[PDB]
Ligand binder design. Structure first.
Ligand SMILES: CCN1CCC(CCNC(=O)Nc2nc3ccc(Sc4nnc5ccc(-c6cccs6)nn45)cc3s2)CC1
Ligand SMILES: [Cl-]
Length: 284
């Protein structure tokens, strides 16, 4: 029943090696549910297996097409797809989980250098996605993960794209407090609106995961911004990094820096720090 050209094209994505899905070990549950897993080939690889609903032959066609597209994306700062198989999406397990919880954790002691380092890795992952004409639409610290080497990987990508939390989404995903001014008015997204979201992600990093605009309700953000306001400078945010955030929030989308310019500018700032400045959480 399926297009035979598509069946041959998806073969390099489909996994036979073999996979052991640990169905009793759940991660999260919107859309489908994520479980722990183990891959093969004479080695055991810890993975996160997402099982999507019960999806018609056209739905199966999209699933196989998405798998090929996803597999064509490879970058150390972008969460990879290991393969596909109910439809199974197999992703590498990220030991330290999401970036927002990692920095919020009071037992963690990040320095200014470490936090800027995480922002730099996110910028590199986004620089890769933009070059592939991929518009993320939901870049936030909650949507970035950390592996065992503390490598940051931009997630919430392709078949894994979901809504895991609700308080950050106005009820198509609308992460209002991370959205560019023009996206709040048109509901359209570009690489330049991902640049706005990246400026917000840098603010999340420097405040160790504080919610942005805490005293502003989701529905009020566009009026708040149009009065001539931006997120205030975090206490442990260096002046050149705050200048970078302000550039990410330029009212004119085309005047915002590209992710390539961000990688470059942030690499310079990052290089000036030695890991002697401990970042503490704000009381407010
Ligand atoms: C002591 C406190 N603390 C310290 C360690 C901590 C982390 C454990 N490590 C993991 O949880 N790793 C993990 N890797 C992966 C790899 C892929 C996927 S699918 C996916 N694609 N994009 C996103 C974006 C968001 C989400 C989710 C949000 C809520 C539930 S899923 N899923 N998602 C999920 C996980 S979850 C647990 C306890
Ligand atoms: Cl430092």
């Amino acid at each position: 029943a399926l297009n035979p050209e598509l069946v041959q094209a998806v073969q390099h994505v489909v996994i036979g090696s073999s996979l052991i899905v640990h169905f009793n070990e759940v991660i999260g549950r919107h859309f489908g549910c994520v479980y722990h897993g183990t891959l093969l080939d004479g080695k055991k690889i810890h993975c996160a297996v997402k099982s999507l609903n019960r999806i018609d032959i056209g739905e199966v066609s999209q699933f196989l097409t998405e798998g090929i597209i996803m597999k064509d994306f490879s970058h150390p700062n972008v969460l990879s797809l290991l393969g596909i198989c109910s439809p199974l999406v197999v992703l590498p397990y990220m030991k330290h989980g999401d970036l927002r919880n990692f920095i919020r954790n009071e037992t963690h002691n990040p320095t200014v250098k470490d936090l800027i380092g995480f922002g730099l890795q996110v910028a590199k992952g986004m620089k890769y996605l933009a070059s592939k004409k991929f518009v993320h639409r939901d870049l936030a610290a909650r949507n970035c993960m950390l592996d065992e080497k503390f490598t940051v990987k931009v997630a919430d990508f392709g078949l894994a794209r979901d809504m895991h939390d609700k308080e950050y989404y106005s009820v198509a995903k609308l992460p209002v407090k991370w959205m560019a001014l023009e996206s709040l008015q048109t509901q359209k997204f570009t690489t330049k609106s991902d640049v706005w979201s990246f400026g917000v992600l840098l603010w999340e990093l420097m405040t160790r995961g504080a919610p942005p605009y805490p005293d502003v309700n989701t529905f009020d953000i566009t009026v708040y911004l149009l009065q001539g306001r931006r997120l205030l400078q975090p206490e442990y945010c260096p002046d050149p990094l705050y200048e970078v955030m302000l550039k990410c929030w330029h009212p004119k989308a085309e005047m915002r820096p590209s992710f390539s310019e961000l990688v470059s500018r942030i690499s310079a700032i990052f290089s000036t720090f030695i890991g002697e400045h401990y970042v503490h959480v704000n009381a407010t």
